Amino acid sequence: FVKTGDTVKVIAGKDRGTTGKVIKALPKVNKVVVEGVAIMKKHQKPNSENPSGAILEIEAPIHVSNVQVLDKNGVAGRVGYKVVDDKKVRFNKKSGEIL
Amino acid sequence: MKRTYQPHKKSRKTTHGFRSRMATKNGRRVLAARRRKGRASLTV
Amino acid sequence: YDIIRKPIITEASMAAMDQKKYTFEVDSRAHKLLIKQAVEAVFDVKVASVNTISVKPKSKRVGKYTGTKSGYKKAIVTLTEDSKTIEI
Amino acid sequence: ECYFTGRKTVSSNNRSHAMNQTKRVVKPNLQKVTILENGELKTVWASAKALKKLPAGVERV
Amino acid sequence: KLSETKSLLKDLRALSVEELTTREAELKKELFDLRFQAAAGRLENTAKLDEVKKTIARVKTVQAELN
RNA sequence: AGCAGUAAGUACGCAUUGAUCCCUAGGUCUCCGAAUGGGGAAACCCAGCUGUUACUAGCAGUUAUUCAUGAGUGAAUACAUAGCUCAUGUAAAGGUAACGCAGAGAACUGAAACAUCUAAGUACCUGCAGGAAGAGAAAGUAAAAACGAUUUCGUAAGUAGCGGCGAGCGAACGCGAAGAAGGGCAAACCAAGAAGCUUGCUUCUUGGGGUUGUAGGACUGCAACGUGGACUUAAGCAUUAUAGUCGAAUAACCUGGGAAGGUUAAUCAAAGAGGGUAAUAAUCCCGUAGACAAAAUAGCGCUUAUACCUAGCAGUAUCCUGAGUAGGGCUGGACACGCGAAAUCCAGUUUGAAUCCGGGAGGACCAUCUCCCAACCCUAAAUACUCCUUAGUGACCGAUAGUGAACCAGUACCGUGAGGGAAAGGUGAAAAGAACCCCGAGAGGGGAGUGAAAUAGCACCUGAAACCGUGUGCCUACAAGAA
RNA sequence: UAUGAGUAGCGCAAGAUAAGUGAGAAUCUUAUCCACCGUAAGACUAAGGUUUCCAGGGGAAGGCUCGUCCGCCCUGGGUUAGUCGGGACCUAAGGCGAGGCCGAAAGGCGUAGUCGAUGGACAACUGGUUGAUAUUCCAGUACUAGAUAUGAUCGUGAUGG
């Protein structure tokens, strides 16, 4: 997409309908780590930067298909973009149009 | 007994140096075969 | 002009310090008189001469293919006394 | 080899009695001559056909 | 942010090589004791190496090329 | 909108202010290498000159050769000449995918052997060229009215022919289609000059003259047509590569680790091509169809005067029209053509015309007739092939295949060399890669936990097959079997 | 993947004990004896090898067995010149060869010239020095050649001889 972002729905996949804030997408990964979503956990060794380890609630990224950006009234769809203003205006379809 | 190659540095060159191979309009041709194939090196 | 590469710190480097010598590096395309006067310029240290030696390249394996580590001309900076040593 | 005589020793092929499929080498006439001086002063080969047609136009050509 | 200021400011003006680039093709052209802190360690701060060589680089390839 | 190639892997950092990135142009461009100041084995050494700036430095450039063009020099020997010196011009040497052309050019074969033939003038090798090359404007074919440069394809048709007439090789004509452009010069003459100025010169230089077949030009008449053709110049126009941009149309339930699968419904429409998405999507995304966008970018094309040389025409004073040239002898070769009745063309060698009342061709050749005008030069187009640039297409192929090479392949490796020449992809969706605990020198294991799954644990999907096993019910330690 | 087959071989010479090392010692290390070679099985030096050297650490494979050891592996250092060998000198044998010669072509020959050492030219040698470099680092003595600083004086005297 364009930079996510906001709370973002997850329609299909392991966790249906879950919304969660994003800023950290890195679209070259083409699947987005979102807090709360795809709860990975790592049994890490008691080593540097965690001298106990065994628990890392870092979470997995899931595909662009299961990312769904909502406009600010919680309404997702398809991003019509660049349409309105100086450089670019993002919106979804059937949406409240905000970014 | 004695084997074939017990070469020295003059021995390992002076048949196969870049001007030796390049010289006679001929070895440079087969070097250009070795370029148009393009193996691991050229001159040796 | 300052085309000195780097110093070299061995355990013999402290013997060079006590000897008022150094172990400095430059580029290959060089001459010990030329880097001698360059050392004289940027350093104002009083040089006797420099020794000759360079180092062959070290082609071992570094990684999953052959580490073709390159050589460099280990310049033995032979000074005279009554000048400015550099302790870096 | 001679320049203004045209060609050279050019290859050919030999015949024989109930021909045995053989080869020849065609050689023209070979004469180093220095005929004229236009600013010439130049020794060069020639062929005898061009010798007999030196008086055709060959004093400068 | 930092780099567009601290790169674009410098020497697009047409003063000359032994004239303007005295700060770069003469002064900080002493790349000594920054390199020479390189591999001496005790530096902790990297980007100056190709940053400064980049600035003297653009100094030469623009300013010590345009004449 | 993050960047910080490969990829972990780190750090200072860096960045919607506009980064990273994409494109275009300019920059610098180590050394070698055509490689070239000189030598030299490839990654070298040693220089000279000119300024530089300082040093028994450094910087920056100049210094290979041949050719051509000048300039100077000036031996035997006076001029000269050779020769030498300097200057100018990448010219140009060189690298080359395939096609071409030209030279040089076999054998093996096959012919049931083989000396003729064939293979083929092919394999190779060398040179010369471009985007194509050659190719070409009748000194043609043909045989009656018969057309009118070439080129490619089909036809004629294995037809005519040739050939130890074996074995084979092999047309052309005419027709059909594409493509369809011809135009200069020397000559003759005329004018200028200079000169054999030995005067009237009869050679050179310049510009007209005109490029010819039913002859044509020069001499007497006498007409301005765009033209790659009678200027394939420059200026605008337009549009394409060269950055890309927008770009429609959906929700729930069941299942599962996960829906796009099943079920329920709805939409769209220049987009239900295709690919991802944990499991098969039109409506999730990339996209897709369409619709926009480029300054520089390499072009293509259109209009413009210009970028310049041509016409008809009647008559015929004489000249011209392509000399060692045609031809003739001999030796070759190609032409279907193997010397033959042998055409016809091109070679060597020898001899050698005529020249417009001319000359040539019409398969030996002699007459009549038909056609043409060589012996001077250029000619697009239709054609051949791709290393290449994408746009792509597949009753291509799926890791012994498909390129030798899906993988750091021409790799490893062999060989001194020329050369040869391998093997190998897949965990899981996502490393979420097994924290911890215990055994163990360690590895490795075992629990725990991980994940949908741990026979799923790093060469990891799936896992036969030979091999080795461990357990298992029966039988065999008086037996000499294709079991 | 068998098989043969746990068989051949274990690559020409003798070690021995104690102690250490470790977890594990025959084979690692030390001590102490023995033993062998010794016109060599010593040292030094060509070509060659191309870092194998040493230091530290480790033991996936390698070591023909083991293996803490190692020319194995990781990491890090280690080679120093006016005089040593070469080049900045000359040149044989030879090669290349502008000129030129001939040749289908490519070419092959070759005058000048050019490189080409195994040759001929020429200054440094004693002592110490590491884990390792020593004629190279330095103490002492030099000498060679040049430089700029400085009373010459006509002097140098060639590719010629």
In order, the DSSP letters of C15-57 are HHHHTTEEEEEE-SS--HHHHHHHHHHHH---EEEE-------
* Contact call for residues B15 and B27 (beta carbons, < 8 A): no
| CA distance to partner chain C, nearest, from residue E15 (Å) | 22
Gap between the Cα atoms of D33 and E42, Å rounded = 88
Lookup result for tokens 């045209």: D6
Residue A96 makes CB contacts below 8 A (sequence gap 6+) with A71, A72, A73, A75
Does A5 sit behind a cis peptide bond, omega within 30 degrees of 0 on the bond before it? Answer: yes
Give me the residue label for tokens 């005790």. E42
User: Which tokens sit at B39?
Assistant: 């193996």
Q: Are E56 and C23 in contact (CB under 8 A)?
A: no
Quote the DSSP letter at residue E22. Answer: G
Resolution expressed in Å: 5.6
CA atoms within 13 Å, Cβ hemisphere of A3? 4
Distance CA A27, CA B1 (A): 69
- Cα distance between residue E15 and residue B15, in whole Å: 58
Report the C-alpha gap between A61 and A67 in whole angstroms: 10
The DSSP code sequence of A16-64 is TT-----S---GGGSEEE-TTSS-------SBTTBSS-S------EEEG
List, in order, residues 6 or more apart from C39 with CB less than 8 Å away: C4, C24, C45, C47, C77
The tokens of D24 are what?
């020849």
Residue C46 contacts residue C79 (beta carbons within 8 Å):
yes
Q: Which of these, C6, C24, C27, lies nearest to C71 by C-alpha position?
A: C27
Separation of alpha carbons E59 and E26, rounded Å = 11
Residue with tokens 């065609």: D26
Contact C88/E at CB under 8 A: yes
Taking any CB pair shorter than 8 Å as contact, residues of chain E touching chain C are: 29-33, 35-36, 38-40
Report how far residue C50's alpha carbon sits from residue C10's, in angstroms, rounded to the nearest whole number. 17
Q: Please, are residues A33 and A24 in contact by the beta-carbon 8 Å criterion?
A: yes
Residue of C nearest to E32 (CA): C2
Q: How far is the CA of A13 from the C1' of F256 (A)?
A: 11
The gap between the terminal CA atoms of chain B, to the nearest Å, is: 27
Closest amino acid to nucleotide F387 (CA–C1'): B36
Phi-psi region of B33 (alpha: psi -120 to 50; beta: other; left: phi over 0): alpha
Chain E nearest-CA residue for C2? E30
Q: What is d(CA C75, CA C53) in angstroms, rounded to the nearest whole number?
A: 7
Q: Return d(Cα A65, Cα A76) in angstroms, integer.
A: 12
Please name every residue paired with C22 in a beta bridge, in sequence order, or none if there are none. Answer: C77
User: Distances from the Cα of D58 to the Cαs of D38, D53, D55, D61, in angstroms?
Assistant: 11, 7, 6, 4
Phi, psi of B19 (to 5 degrees): -85, -30
Q: E63: which DSSP letter? A: I
